[PDB]
Design a protein around this ligand. Structure first.
Ligand SMILES: CS(=O)(=O)NCCc1ccccc1
Length: 185
């Protein structure tokens, strides 16, 4: 892929974070805390899962960013509508306003309904996310494996502004404490 030149500087929006998340000073890293992080509740915060949004909103154009997932056992990444549900239980699907992939229990899957098995030969340490708003495309790239394609959502019906979407995953195992990091341009 030659999408690198649509690179955008993403920062995390503290106000949207689940109350257990710890976002770094530079708003470029997020990890699961071992307790509630002493913030007030608000209607924006994801309540049921360790999720957070990027601050940036996209309604046109081509955008690209990269995320470090080194030594995590579980995470979700992609984009979502600004209007997605924040409270209660829900599935990650385009019908609910999400265009995502994930790692869970040693397999990679795309967040279709039902989910799609991904075929990755080289476990990624960094993921590239490309959005073409006008074309209705969200693509995922394996930066560890020379930028190889992971998955393309096409015919996307965004139906609103998009925000970068992150889930650091649960850390029930003690093996998933590591952060998600936005990688430099
Ligand atoms: C073992 S743990 O640290 O990952 N426990 C997390 C508890 C939690 C439940 C729902 C949403 C956010 C956090």
């Amino acid at each position: 892929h030659h999408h690198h030149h649509h690179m955008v500087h993403i920062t995390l929006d503290r106000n949207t974070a689940n109350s257990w998340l710890i976002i770094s000073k530079d708003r470029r890293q997020v990890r699961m805390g071992d307790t509630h992080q002493n913030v007030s509740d608000n209607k924006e915060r994801f309540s049921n899962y360790p999720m957070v949004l990027g601050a940036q909103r996209f309604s046109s154009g081509k955008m690209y960013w990269e995320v470090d997932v080194t030594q995590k056992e579980a995470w979700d990444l992609g984009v979502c509508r600004d209007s997605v549900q924040r409270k209660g239980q829900f599935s990650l699907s385009p019908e609910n306003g999400f265009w995502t992939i994930w790692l869970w229990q040693d397999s990679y899957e795309a967040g279709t309904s039902p989910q799609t098995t991904l075929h990755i030969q080289v476990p990624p340490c960094q993921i590239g996310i490309f959005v073409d708003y006008e074309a209705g495309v969200v693509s995922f790239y394996n930066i560890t494996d020379h930028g190889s394609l992971i998955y393309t959502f096409s015919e996307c019906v965004f139906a609103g502004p998009l925000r970068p979407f992150f889930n650091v995953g649960f850390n029930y195992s003690g093996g998933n404490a590591a952060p998600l990091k936005l990688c430099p341009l």
